[PDB]
Amino acid sequence: MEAAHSKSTEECLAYFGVSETTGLTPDQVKRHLEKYGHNELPAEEGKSLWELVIEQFEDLLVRILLLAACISFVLAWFEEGEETITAFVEPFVILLILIANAIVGVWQERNAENAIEALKEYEPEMGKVYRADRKSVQRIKARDIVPGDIVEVAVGDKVPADIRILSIKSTTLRVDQSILTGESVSVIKHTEPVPDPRAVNQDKKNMLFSGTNIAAGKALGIVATTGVSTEIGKIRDQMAATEQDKTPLQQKLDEFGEQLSKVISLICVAVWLINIGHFNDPVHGGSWIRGAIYYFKIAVALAVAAIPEGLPAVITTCLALGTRRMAKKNAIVRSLPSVETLGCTSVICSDKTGTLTTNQMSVCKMFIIDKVDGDFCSLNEFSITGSTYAPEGEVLKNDKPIRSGQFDGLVELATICALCNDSSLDFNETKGVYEKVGEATETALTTLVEKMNVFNTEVRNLSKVERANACNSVIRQLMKKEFTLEFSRDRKSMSVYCSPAKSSRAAVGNKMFVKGAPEGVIDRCNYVRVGTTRVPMTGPVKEKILSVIKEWGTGRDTLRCLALATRDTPPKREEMVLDDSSRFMEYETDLTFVGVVGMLDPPRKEVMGSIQLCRDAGIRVIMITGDNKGTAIAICRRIGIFGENEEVADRAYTGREFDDLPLAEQREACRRACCFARVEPSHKSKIVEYLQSYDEITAMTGDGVNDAPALKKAEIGIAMGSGTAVAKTASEMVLADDNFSTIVAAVEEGRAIYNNMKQFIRYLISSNVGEVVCIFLTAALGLPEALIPVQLLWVNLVTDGLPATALGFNPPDLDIMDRPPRSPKEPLISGWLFFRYMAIGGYVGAATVGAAAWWFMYAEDGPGVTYHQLTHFMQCTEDHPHFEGLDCEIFEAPEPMTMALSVLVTIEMCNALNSLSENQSLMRMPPWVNIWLLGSICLSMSLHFLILYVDPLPMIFKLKALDLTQWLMVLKISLPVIGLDEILKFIARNYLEG
Ligand SMILES: C/C=C(/C)C(=O)O[C@H]1C(C)=C2[C@H]([C@@H]1OC(=O)CCCCCCC)[C@@](C)(OC(C)=O)C[C@H](OC(=O)CCC)[C@@]1(O)[C@H]2OC(=O)[C@@]1(C)O
Ligand SMILES: Nc1ncnc2c1ncn2[C@@H]1O[C@H](COP(=O)(O)OP(=O)(O)O)[C@@H](O)[C@H]1O
Ligand SMILES: [Mg+2]
Ligand SMILES: [Mg+2]
Ligand code: NA
Structure with a gap:
C-alpha cells in the first residue's frame, strides 16, 4: 500500500485482510511473498575475476x-x-x-565500493511479527517479512520495512529518521491518518521507514511496503x-x-x-x-x-x-x-545550513509590547550580545545595558523560552566551551534565558558546569510542565501545558506557552500582553508587530524569527486529546501575544570571499535552503549571491512555485536562478537534470540517503564529512569541514x-x-x-x-x-x-x-x-x-x-x-x-x-x-x-x- 499514511488504521487491515491480534495466516504469508517478493534490495551483479580480468x-x-x-x-x-x-x-x-x-x-x-551496496547497511537481519500460527511474537529474518505482516518494534530496533503504525504501546513513540529526512532530532509518531496522498516523508507522522531507528517507545504496525517499494528502496532504484x-x-x-x-x-x-x-x-x-x-x-x-x-x-x-x-x-x-x-x-549548488553558515544559533534581538492606547502603540526592542551558546552576554535597550527583570513582559518572554523547549546546555570540561543538547534553534532560546536572568540569581557563584542551566532551572521550578504538543510543519508552532508549582486544592491557574513561526502564531492571538496586563489585539498593533518581523527577517539582519505567546485560559486538561496532532492548532488558539525573538545563524567568515572568487571564475552559485523565500533572498544578498539592490523576482523560487511552473519554464528558471527555498525531496535531482541540459558541470552538496540520487547524478556530488556514509559513497568529494569555501578551493x-x-x-x-x-x-x-x-x-x-x-x-x-x-x-x-x-x-x-x-x-x-x-x-x-x-x-x-x-x-x-x-x-x-x-x-x-x-x-x-x-x-x-x-x-x- 503506497498510500498507507493517508489510510485509517482500519482501512489498512481491511486492505490486506489481516487481523491485528493474530497476524497473517501461513497461506497469506505464502501468497504475499509470491506477490511481493522478499523484503530486500536486489543483489549487485556477479562481476567475476575472469570477467574483471578480461x-x-x-x-x-x-x-x-x-x-x-x-x-x-x-x-x-x-x-x-x-x-x-x-x-x-x-x-x-x-x-x-x-x-x-x-x-x-x-x-x-x-x-x-558503490553507494547502492551501502544502502544494505540500513536493512536489519531480523524483524518481529505476529502471525496466526503462534500466540507470542516471533522474530524472523527481515527479508521474510511481507506487506500485510503485523510487526512490533521497540527502542533500539532498526525498522525492517515501511510500516503503518497501528498501535503505540508506550506513552509515546520516537524515531530517529535522520538518514531519510535530515531531521537529526528524533520525531514523535502518531496513529491518525495524514489526509494528503502526496505528503512528503517528513509529514507521514504515522509511518515508520525501513532503515530508520526507534529512539524511544514500543509500537505495533502493519507492513505497507517492502523491498524496492519502500522509501529507501525507491532511492536505491533512482540510483541504479x-x-x-x-x-x-x-x-x-x-x-x-x-x-x-x-x-x-x-x-x-x-x-x-x-x-x-x-x-x-x-x-x-x-x-x-x-x-x-x-x-x-x-x-x-x-x-x-x-x-x-x-x-x-x-x-x-x-x-x-x-x-x-x-x-x-x-x-x-x-x-x-x-x-x-x-x-x-560551472555551477555549484550548496545547502545553506552548516555549509554557507555555521549553524551556531544566537538570539540578537527581541521585543515586547510597551504600550497600546488606541491608535497609539509602542514596542520595547532589545539586543543581546554573544554569538556562542555560552551564557556569556548581556541585554541592551538602545545600546544601553538594562536588567531584564525590570520589564515583566520579559519575565514571561523568558518563561516561554525556558518551558516550551526540549533543549538544554552542557559545559564540556574537555573542549572548554559550552555545547548544545538538542536543536540549535531551541538551544539559542536556552542560552537567551541565562543571559536575560529575569529573576537575578547567584549565577556568578556557581561553577561553569552549574552556570550552564541556571536561570532555566529557576523558571522550571515555578511551573510544572504537564505535557507538550510537538511542533509540526502544518501549524509551524509548538506549545507546552503548564500548571503552577505552589497551588493547593484547586482546578484553575494553568497556562499554555506557545512558540513558533510568527504569521501563524500571531494570527491565532486575540490578545496582546502589555507588561502584566492584557488588551484586545487590533489591526494597527498587529501590523506594527508584523512590520518589525518583516524588517528583521528580510532586512540586512537576516534573522530567523519566532513569536512567543501564551494561552491564558487553556482548555480543561480532560477536554484535550494529546494523540491527534491534527487538533493541536485548535488548542493553541485564543492566544496572548508576548514577544518576538530574532536569531542568527551567521555566514561562515570565508563564504563572502569564496562567493566572490566564484564570480571571478565565472562559476554560478545556487543556494538551497529551508528558509522561507524572503529570508532566503535576504541571506543571498548578505553573502554576495545577489546584489544588495538587484532584481531577483525571476532568480529565486520556493519548491511550490517551481512545481507550478510547466516543465519548459522550470528548465529556464534553472539557468538563471541562484536561490531555491523550501525545496521538495525530488527537486535537487530535477535541478541537476535541467542544469545538465545546458551542458553545465554541476557540483551539488548533500548528506543523507535522500540526497544520494542527486549526489550521484551531479558531475561532482559533494558530501558532508559529518554526513552519512551513504551520501559520502555516492559523492565524488567529501568536505572534512563541511565548509562551502572548501569547494571553491x-x-x-x-x-x-x-x-x-x-x-x-x-x-x-x-x-x-x-x-x-x-x-x-x-x-x-x-x-x-x-x-x-x-x-x-x-x-x-x-x-x-x-x-x-x-x-x-x-x-x-x-x-x-x-x-x-x-x-x-x-x-x-x-x-x-x-x-x-x-x-x-x-x-x-x-x-x-x-x-x-x-x-x-x-x-x-x-x-x-x-x-x-x-x-x-x-x-x-x-x-x-x-x-x-x-x-x-x-x-x-x-x-x-x-x-x-x-x-x-x-x-x-x-x-x-x-x-x-x-x-x-x-x-x-x-x-x-x-x-x-x-x-x-x-x-x-x-x-x-x-x-x-x-x-x-x-x-x-x-x-x-x-x-x-x-x-x-x-x-x-x-x-x-x-x-x-x-x-x-x-x-x-x-x-x-x-
Ligand atoms: C601518437 C602518434 C601519432 C603519430 C598519431 O597517429 O597521432 C595522431 C592522433 C591520433 C591525433 C593527432 C595525430 O595526428 C597526426 O600527427 C597527423 C598524421 C601524421 C602522422 C603520420 C606519419 C606518417 C595529434 C596527437 O597530433 C599532433 C601533431 O599533436 C593531436 C590530437 O591529440 C590530442 O589532442 C591528444 C588527446 C589526448 C588529435 O588530433 C589526435 O586525434 C584526435 O582525435 C585528437 C584531437 O585527440
Ligand atoms: N522548535 C521549534 N518550535 C516552534 N517553532 C519552530 C521550531 N523550529 C522552527 N520553528 C518555526 O517554524 C518554521 C519552519 O520550521 P522548519 O520546518 O523546522 O524549518 P527549518 O528547516 O528552517 O528549520 C520556522 O520558520 C520557525 O519560525
Ligand atoms: Mg540532509
Ligand atoms: Mg528545522
Ligand atoms: Na555525481
Missing part, C-alpha cells in the same frame, strides 16, 4: 599492444640463430606491461537508473585511441603502397620470408611507438599527488578522475592540476609522434631499424615518465580563478599547436633516422659509405657494393641504434623544457622555474648511461657507449629542437593575437 583488455590501445605482443612472440620464434638470450625479451616486456596493467585494474575494482558519463579527459583519451588506431592502420597501408614496386621484382631470388619479417617488425615498433604506454601511470601519479594535497585543505576527493571535472565546475586546485596535466600530456603524446615518424621514415626508405620496441618502451615508461611527472608540478598561473570555466569540449591539441607538434614530430623523426644513418656512413667507427645505399639492399645475396672481404651483418650494429636513442632521449629532455609553458619562451620563463623538472632530467640521463654501461643492460637494449665525438653529434642534432619550438612560440605570440 575487461582490462577492452581498450583499443591495449588490444593493439596485445596484437603486437603476439607478432613479437611469433618473430622471437620463427627466427634463425641461437641468439635466444635476447629473443623473448621484447615479447615478455610487452606482455609484462599488459599483465601489470590488468593487475592494477583488478586491484581497484576489489577496493571500490542513474548513469554517470566519463570525464572530459576520459572522453578525449578514448577518441584519441580510436583515431590512433585508425592512423596506425593507415601508416601500414602507406608503408605498403610506398613499396608496391616490389611487385616489379623477379619472382626467383630475394628473401621473401626475410622480408615479411621486416614488415611485421616495423608494425611492432609502429604500435609501440604510437602508444604513450606510460601515460596512464603518469596521470594517476599526478592525481594521487594532487589528491593528497587537496586533503590537507579539507577536500577529500574519492574519484581521481573527478579532480578534472572539479576544475570544470578544491575547484581552483582542480584548475591548476589540469593545466599541468595538459602539459605533460602534450609532452608525452608529442614524443610518440616523433617515434612514429622515425619508424615511418625508416620503413619508407627501407633502412635498418634505428629504434627497437624495447628501447621505445624504456623511453615511454622511464626516460620520459620522470620529466612528464615533474611537469605535473609546474607552477600555476596567477589568473587561475580570473578565467571562466574551461569548456569540456576543449581539445588538448589543435590549430597552431597541432602544427607545432607536427613540426617537432617531423624534426624528431628525421633527427633519429639521420643519426643512425650518420653512423652507418660519415662516421669513423662505422662503414663509411657516403651517399651509399643501405636502402639498395639488406641481404648481401648479391653483394654489389663490397668487392673484397667477408663481412655483411653489420647493419645490426648497436652503435647506430644507440645514436638514434640518444638523440631521442636528448630531444625529449629538451622538449620537456619546451613544455614548461605553452607559448612562453624559455627566455621569459626560465627552465629553473620548475626545479623538479631539472632534477628529473638529471635522473633520466643517469638512467640512460645506466643502460649503457651496466653489462646486463646494454645487451638487452642492444646499445653501446658512444665516443665523445659521437655524443657531440647527438648534441648537434638534439639541441636545435629548442630553437625550432622557440621560433614557433614566437609566432603564436606575435602573429596570432586578437
